[PDB]
Structure 1
């Protein structure tokens, strides 16, 4: 499996900070055939970012609509993304599930619209603290994946991302071993719903707090194939994180 390292800049950046960050990133030598490295800037920065990054870097947007083209003010459709050759789209990120009520149904619809339009999707999911304390991790994760995994036609085009909400801003820390346990389980689900061959080829990224100190210990786990980096991807030291997957 090819490792995958994605930078989700979320809602950050200015024309000038991006110019400075992209320059640093372009300095890093890596072979895109052996490693996928994707950057996800804010939508209004997509074009600026795509022109500043060397083609070895892939780019994508942080959200796509579940609707097609039409009367949907403020939405960006898969059809529109396709016309711009936008390669990746993030779906189901917890911030959208939390602040903008996105449901498993929405996640499903968006993945369907994305695949139909040849876009590659990075799908997020994970349990919260209350859910982990009740020992419902497995149950929750199973129900979230099964909400969209039948739509996956091609296992190189859909990337899964495990987000340990229970460890996001709650003060509890997730260990590499703990991440690995969940990742192994996720792969099992994919295995017993899509096939053993399919399960071994789909990338499952860890999406908790990743930095230059813990990345090597996370990437080394058997079922962790890369990351979805948050704030650490807003720094020049991001290149160090990429290197841990080389």
Structure 2
């Protein structure tokens, strides 16, 4: 499996700061075996895609579930392709838990994006009250089942596990805890989809990753990379891209 590092800029960006990030990425020494993605705010997707070499993927942070229609404020996968972007992040914990997106909606968006020819980073993960009730697998598997319900092919999917129970609380997840979830998710893929897909699919870690912990997380056998948050805006991003080499 090819190591995969995606930088989610979240709601951060400006012509000035984007240019500084692009110059940092363009000039950095990055492991040639790392697949690298950045996800700017939607206003900046076309310009960031023009300025950054195709060695870098550029992703939207969200999209909707049909090509066009009466959905004020939404953008479709067809529009993403029209501006040269071939990736989207769907189901991020902030969209599920702050902006109230349901499992079913995330699954419908994922299936439509794939149908349009857009690759998807599909995000899953459980909150603290769910983890403390023993529901880590139940929650992760329910979110994946909603994606599988509408998907017939997985070659253009990357799964991101977000330990929301740690992100939202200030707790720190150990590399052993991340590995344990990644393994359970991979076994679900083996069981519900196929051993070949489970063997191929990248499962990336979306808890807090900085230059300080990326190398120990990267060595875990079922962690295939990272969905990076705030470190995506900083020189730490380069060390994270290099975490596996």
TM-score for the superposition, normalised by structure 2? 0.96
In structure 1, the partner of 2:28 is 28
C-alpha distance in 2 between matches for 1:245 and 1:38? 16
C-alpha distance in 1 between matches for 2:52 and 2:82? 19
In structure 2, the partner of 1:75 is 74
Structure-to-structure mapping, 1:153-232, within 5 angstroms? 153-232=152-231
CA contact (8 A) 2:46 2:84 kept: no
In structure 2, the partner of 1:130 is 129
Q: Secondary structure at the match of 1:200?
A: helix
CA deviations 1:127-176 (Å, max 9, x no partner) are 00001111111111111111112444443310000000000131211000
Structure 1 segments of 4 or more deviating over 4 A? none
C-alpha distance in 1 between matches for 2:219 and 2:35? 17
C-alpha displacement of 1:84: 2.3
Q: Secondary structure at the match of 1:86?
A: coil
TM-score for the superposition, normalised by structure 1? 0.95
Q: 1:137 to 1:209 in 2, by over 3 A?
A: same
In structure 1, the partner of 2:140 is 141
2:43 maps to 1:18? no
CA contact (8 A) 2:107 2:149 kept: no
Count of paired positions: 245
Tell me whether 90-99 or 151-160 shows the greater mean CA deviation.
151-160
CA contact (8 A) 1:155 1:201 kept: no
Give unpaired runs (5+ residues) of structure 2.
none
Q: Secondary structure at the match of 2:58?
A: strand
C-alpha displacement of 1:98: 1.3
